[PDB]
A paper describes a structure:
The results indicated that only one molecule of BA binds to the [name]γ ligand binding domain (LBD) with a Kd of 4 μM. There are two independent protein molecules in the asymmetric unit (chain A and B). In chain A, there is clear density in the region usually occupied by [name]γ full agonists where it was possible to fit a single molecule of BA. The first BA molecule has all its methyl groups engaged in vdW contacts with the protein environment (L453, F282, M364, C285, L330, V339). The carboxylate group makes H-bonds bridging the hydroxyl moieties of Y327 and S289. One of the two oxygen atoms is also engaged in a H-bond with the side-chain of H323. In contrast, BA contacts the Y473 OH by vdW interactions through a carbon atom of its 5-membered ring (shortest C-O distance: 3.1 Å). The H-bond network involving the triad Y473, H323 and H449 is less stable than that realized by full agonists such as rosiglitazone, as denoted by the slightly shifted position of the activation function-2 helix (AF2 or H12) from its active conformation, with the consequent loss of the H-bond between the H449 ring and the Y473 OH (distance of 3.6 Å). From the crystal structure, a steric clash is seen between carbon atoms of the ligand and the ring of H449 (shortest distance 2.9 Å). Moreover, the environment around H449 is different than that of the complex with rosiglitazone, because the F363 side-chain changes its conformation owing to a steric clash with one methyl of BA (3.0 Å), and approaches H449 (3.3 Å), L453 (3.6 Å), L452 (3.7 Å), and the methyl group of I456 (3.5 Å) which is slightly displaced from its original position.
Numbering used by the authors: 207 to 263, 276 to 474
The structure:
């Protein structure tokens, strides 16, 4: 029944709003020269980075650890969202952990695109905006952490998804079932099939002039995969040349 799929979409969207403090809708209102209400302080170089530390509250490394923090917070938020997905907490606990382990980074880059445009990315709950060029200009093992994320975002943002779309898409990603190490794949797959039906209907209703958006959205999952892969191998480099830099245990247990 279409009706049941709509109720599912609304529940996920509702849970999404409750779990993620910075929505795409708020991010777009901040980014677009829309408001005096609160536009961001813009960090595009060293001194503005400093002054930025006063307005908003070594460079390259310190920025990297600022990233590390926000990812941890993002993992907490995504974990909270995951529990609201019907069926998820009824799964074998080990599989819940596995689904989170592999899904969380793909979600983080999906939602990261909401905070990006071509020029840079919102930081600190949208109070700040850090320039793409400034991130690229950073010291050499760090200066290209962010670039492939920008490249993803620019293309992904061209699908023009809104938060109600993204809420279902993010659920679809979590409930994959082709994740390494899963004990019971069939209950995961039955949940994903429901989610996929919901997403498909959502996209047809919300974007009726956007043909095959559903298929085009699913194809984006390959882009996410390779961002993660490339990000991971970049992290292995950093941990060897920067022996004094530390990773977060919540983040470290995710990579393996
Ligand atoms: C170890 C890291 C540096 C964390 C976990 C890996 C990470 C990850 O997988 O998230 C790569 C992308 C990103 C550096 C995050 C942190 C969160 C962060 C984000 C949102 C918040 C802090 C930063 O100020 C800013 C604006 C550059 C963004 C952009 C990218 C990421 C997603 C990484």
């Amino acid at each position: 029944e279409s009706a049941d799929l709509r109720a599912l979409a609304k529940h996920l969207y509702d849970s999404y709003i409750k779990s993620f403090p910075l929505t795409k809708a708020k991010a777009r209102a901040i980014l677009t020269g829309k408001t005096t209400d609160k536009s961001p302080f813009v960090i595009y170089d060293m001194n503005s980075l400093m002054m930025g530390e006063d307005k908003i509250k070594e460079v390259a490394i310190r920025i990297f650890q600022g990233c590390q923090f926000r990812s941890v917070e993002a993992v907490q938020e995504i974990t909270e969202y995951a529990k609201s997905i019907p069926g998820f907490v009824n799964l074998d606990l080990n599989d819940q952990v596995t689904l989170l382990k592999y899904g969380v980074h793909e979600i983080i880059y999906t939602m990261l695109a909401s905070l990006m445009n071509k020029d840079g990315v919102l930081i600190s709950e949208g109070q700040g905006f850090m320039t793409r060029e400034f991130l690229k200009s950073l010291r050499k093992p760090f200066g290209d952490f962010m670039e492939p994320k920008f490249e993803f975002a620019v293309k992904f943002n061209a699908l023009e998804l809104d938060d109600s779309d993204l809420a279902i898409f993010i659920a679809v990603i979590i409930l994959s079932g082709d994740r390494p190490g899963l004990l019971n794949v069939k209950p995961i797959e039955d949940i994903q099939d429901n989610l996929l039906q919901a997403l498909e209907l959502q996209l047809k209703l919300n974007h009726p002039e956007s043909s095959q958006l559903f298929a085009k959205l699913l194809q984006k999952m390959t882009d996410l995969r390779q961002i993660v892969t490339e990000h991971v191998q970049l992290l292995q480099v950093i941990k060897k040349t920067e022996t004094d830099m530390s990773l977060h245990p919540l983040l470290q247990e995710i990579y393996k």
